[PDB]
Amino acid sequence: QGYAAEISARRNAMDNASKNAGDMINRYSILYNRTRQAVITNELVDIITGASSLG
Amino acid sequence: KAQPTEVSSILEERIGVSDEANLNETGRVLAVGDGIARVFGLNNIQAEELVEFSSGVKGMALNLEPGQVGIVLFGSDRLVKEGELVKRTGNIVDVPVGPGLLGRVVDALGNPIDGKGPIDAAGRSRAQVKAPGILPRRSVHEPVQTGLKAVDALVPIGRGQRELIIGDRQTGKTAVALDTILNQKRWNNGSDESKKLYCVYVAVGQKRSTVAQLVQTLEQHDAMKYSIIVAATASEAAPLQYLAPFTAASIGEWFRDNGKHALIVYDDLSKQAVAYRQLSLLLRRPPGREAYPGDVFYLHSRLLERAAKLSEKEGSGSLTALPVIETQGGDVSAYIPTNVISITDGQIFLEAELFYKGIRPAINVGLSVSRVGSAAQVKALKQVAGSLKLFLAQYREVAAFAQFGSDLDASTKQTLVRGERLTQLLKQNQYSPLATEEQVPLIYAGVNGHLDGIELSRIGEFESSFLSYLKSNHNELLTEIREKGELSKELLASLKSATESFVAT
Amino acid sequence: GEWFRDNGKHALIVYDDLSKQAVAYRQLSLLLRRPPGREAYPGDVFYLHSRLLERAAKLSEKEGSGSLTALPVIETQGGDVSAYI
Amino acid sequence: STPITGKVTAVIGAIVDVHFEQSELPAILNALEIKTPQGKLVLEVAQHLGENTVRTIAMDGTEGLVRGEKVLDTGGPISVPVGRETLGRIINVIGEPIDERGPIKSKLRKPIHADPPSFAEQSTSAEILETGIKVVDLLAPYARGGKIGLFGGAGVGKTVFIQELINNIAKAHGGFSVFTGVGERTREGNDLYREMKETGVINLEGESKVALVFGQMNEPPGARARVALTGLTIAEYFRDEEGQDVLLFIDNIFRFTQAGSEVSALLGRIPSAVGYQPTLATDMGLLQERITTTKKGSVTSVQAVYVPADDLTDPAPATTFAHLDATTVLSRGISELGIYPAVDPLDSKSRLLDAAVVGQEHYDVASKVQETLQTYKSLQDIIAILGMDELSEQDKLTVERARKIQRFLSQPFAVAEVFTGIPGKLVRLKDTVASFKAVLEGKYDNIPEHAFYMVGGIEDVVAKAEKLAAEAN
Amino acid sequence: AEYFRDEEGQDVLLFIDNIFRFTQAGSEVSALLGRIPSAVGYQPTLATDMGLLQERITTTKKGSVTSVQAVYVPADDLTDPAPATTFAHLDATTVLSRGISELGIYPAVDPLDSKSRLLDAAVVGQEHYDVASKVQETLQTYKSLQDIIAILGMDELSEQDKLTVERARKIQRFLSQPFAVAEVFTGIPGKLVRLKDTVASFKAVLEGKYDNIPEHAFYMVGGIEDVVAKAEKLAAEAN
Amino acid sequence: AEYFRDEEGQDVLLFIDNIFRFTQAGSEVSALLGRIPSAVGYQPTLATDMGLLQERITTTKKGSVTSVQAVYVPADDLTDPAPATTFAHLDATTVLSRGISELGIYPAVDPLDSKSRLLD
């Protein structure tokens, strides 16, 4: 009985873990997209600024 | 008929101006590419002066140089050709102001696009007017009854309180200020001007079909007799979209300086920032964070600072502002909104998931707040909603706590049930504003746990049922809430009896 | 390859790679003071490869049904497809 | 009469500079011709640099050019031929027929940079464009003169879907179709044209019901940032001359955005965010607001959207989503179940899915359908795990209902008649509402699930039920 | 301010809001002043103008200037050059996180990242230093365990770690303090809590004398006696 | 090295470090040569200068050059092009890794990415 109770609460805990991991993936994907866009933009700024101070 | 030819021929008589047409301005256009134009001459031009090109397109001379002047266009460059003749108006950029602007739909320059003839303007006013100093102000003390449930419950708005509506795409943002304008029909049908409140909606960079349907809808509910629409749609030039909210702000200042009370709604400042960085990059000016020029904070700053409550020395005018910011995926850490948050007097966050759950309005209470709204809340609502935000934050605490399926005590399960009832309570359909006398008893029922025995699905019919119940029967109490805006103990107990009566069903 | 293709024949070409070729064209355009774009690339670099790869085709029986087939090679960096080239 | 002869002074890739003689300068956005040995080369005045000298961008390859050659000005913008002659012709961005069926003997030619219709000319209430397809007319209804974001990669019958749309508009409303491949793969454009001949929407001798414009990939960005405006002007003619509802099909809007960004890059403008052009909102709004519903008629535009590297905060889909009134998603999983079309029911959403738009009944029907399929999709885990044992009579009813709808969403195609043999059905709106409503009430729960796969309507429900009952007997 | 510091020789409270707006004003004109744009979008003369501003804000032998300056952070990026430059000029940092405010913790001071040139055991007293040391250790332990709490929760902890997380989360709610200024946001009277009582309060919390008291009774409270009072109210009301 | 290969006819070992300082110093001046700054902060003339330096390092039929080049990787980024170009010039790539050094094990070689052309 405690064996089945353990596997029940274990299955519950792994379900909660999958749910929390999905939520945290949903946050860090948005963080990833903002980071990627900011990196490309910020290096393009330096590309332009070098092309800005030409003769 | 021929009366349009009569009016146009009187305008042909004005076309008298040719007898005194010695313009001290005309100069050749050096170059004109990428939404800009360098013009030689104009040696008595003023800074930020309106000029007009030979192809009819006007422009603002923005930067002055020894040798030339760089003038931005107010349209497509397809009309402006090199080497032409550039007459100056003689004026810093001004727009028509006056009462006849009500009902009309204009461009960024007050030129009407409704096709309803000319504009009865009471004057012309500059665009970049100084915001009033700290002395001709007053702290807000008068409510702005938006008609929405959770808005008027949790985030009250003072006359002149600069409150941000922030959200995401297709998240019910526009409908909020729309239904606020529709609530203002109550007093705009009335007679006291200090009770009246005039509405200016500023649609920039949007679809002409969308603006047409909005104007159509405002004519259906007959908000048009107090409405002013400023259209700066996406087909039009970026400087027009840059310029139009300043013009509507001048209109709001015209109403405010007449002692009257007025509401302006910006929708959206996000595209205005896009147009402004489009300008600045075509000005070859260096960008900063997220490719914006660093003055874009100063831009929306100097826009929104021209909206406050005048003191009695100025005639107690007010001008309340509703900016709209479309963010990207619920982000509140992009460079543009964090600037606006540092300007406005509070936030109305719309969570995408709540509207994805169909909860309309999709108000995240935990993010949305006003700073000085409590000083100008309706006094009855201030009486009856003191525990309300506390109880909703309390229910929010046990909201994420109850997802684990664990059973709880009667206290937290009680807060769970009552907060579910309050959550399903505050939904509200579009074009359905609620008066304060209507909003009071729903709050009084929601506080005192009467909704707990009612089914969670039954709440929506229960609302209208109990409202029609009171309007049928306790109409005297509705008039008491209307007249006082404040519940006495006798009104409190009579309200209690009138609730618990229909709570028995 | 188009010589074989217009002989009613069958030609496979393998470009290996195109990433170095894009770097070379980037260098040529940057030293020619053309205005750079994303990751300092020129604007027409897409116009480069689109003008390249469309030269491989499968011809008509009216033409003689020649066939040029292209196998280009893209060296990615860190297993990324979001990079511009 | 007056040849405005210009001289080439600078050729930089696709950028051409022309010095003119005095007081002869054309305005911005005008076609300029150069008689090459290989044809004509077209230029487009975009920047008056002063000194009687302007800057244009190319419309084809700029090889072998000598600076100082005679430049012929057309005065106006790019004239493109319009009219009944244009149906079933393959047209470049220039306006020339490239199907090698001879010249297009159109009567009128129109400039491509026309203005959008005024605010007064906007039809102040978007009705529903009745397409003919059950799922589209049910779940994500299209505005008559609206914007439609089609998602999904190739291989899902997306071309089959859009040809079925062409035939359903041709039968239903009689308006025509204008397809526009901006940056289209030339091999795939050929396969598309060959199929459209074979499926009959192009009749080489009779009435082709569609006009094609293919800006191929090998064309400079000056072409590909104008192919969309060419197809736009062609559709605007059939709206504003014939008073119809004309459907503009655009692939790809994202390649068009790339073209506009590359054009702004080659003009030496400072790039904005993401590497896109700084004129991105304006370059979009010049395309969108010329697509609307007049009082003469409407142009309804369906356009594919590639999501770039699977990001929605990317400003090009974030700009496109500020115009799309309705979305349509061709998932693989729906085509995986052998369902034609491959429409995901859950994702394809409209801003006109509203009771004050489609009426209260259509709204409530679509509401119950979305709720039923949402509950079904939520149950799909324990359906495979535990089975129908955990379903109550509340539940297994709704599970069966959603299976019946999921088969019933499938529609025979008038274009998949050489493919499947089953003729398609122009399924009307009012039949579709009542059909899904009678399924939502449960009046055909006795009918098996198999009697719903690839059917027209509720009359075809009853007919296939009786036929499968007779074949089982 | 420096006039009264020099002419009068008094104690000058200089409140500045917002010092970031100054550097931003230095940024907006610099592109028009012909300068090449520097880092991010700011001006090249950032640290120099910041220095000439800050070095006049000082305490001489003549007078005493106690200055408090708000610092706006652009989009919560502390790696922005303007606040990072500003850190070099300050004696006592105090950092407000939005995420701490999202837990309703007012004020939303980060307990870790605040620093001082003060807080030495031979300055604040040894016991004060020790208590603050143990508080920072406890909260650092909690912030380290935060990710495992996010994935697994408090159940997959060791019991010493679980007790530490419990005590730290009690401490976090105990940090919040009712303001007389923000009374219109709370309806709660402000709490001017003395120093030594605060030290003994955190002492007894680190000693765990109130681990029996639930976490919510620590929230938005004055001294530890007020935690006792609020726990009494929760015991009498929640029952 | 070229002298002791070709003018000598003899096996030559070659030990170059740092090859990254070459491209680095080219980038350090190419901005002040009036070149438009390319990608990552490097010069536009990266692959050409790297090629002309590497292709003069070879084993001819006249003599053998064995090249050992220690290459700097800025902040352990292999997708940095100035390390990433160098992979095209090398037969025996041998990769160190800081995370392996965090185990304290020496030599902290990645057993995976250190490939060979001689691994037949």
Ligand SMILES: Nc1ncnc2c1ncn2[C@@H]1O[C@H](COP(=O)(O)OP(=O)(O)OP(=O)(O)O)[C@@H](O)[C@H]1O
């Ligand atoms: N209370 C409500 N009742 C009915 N519909 C609502 C309500 N609130 C929002 N909606 C729906 O939300 C949709 C979006 O409305 P709205 O335009 O205000 O959102 P938005 O975020 O402002 O979009 P945009 O920014 O594109 O204008 C509308 O289709 C409307 O039907």
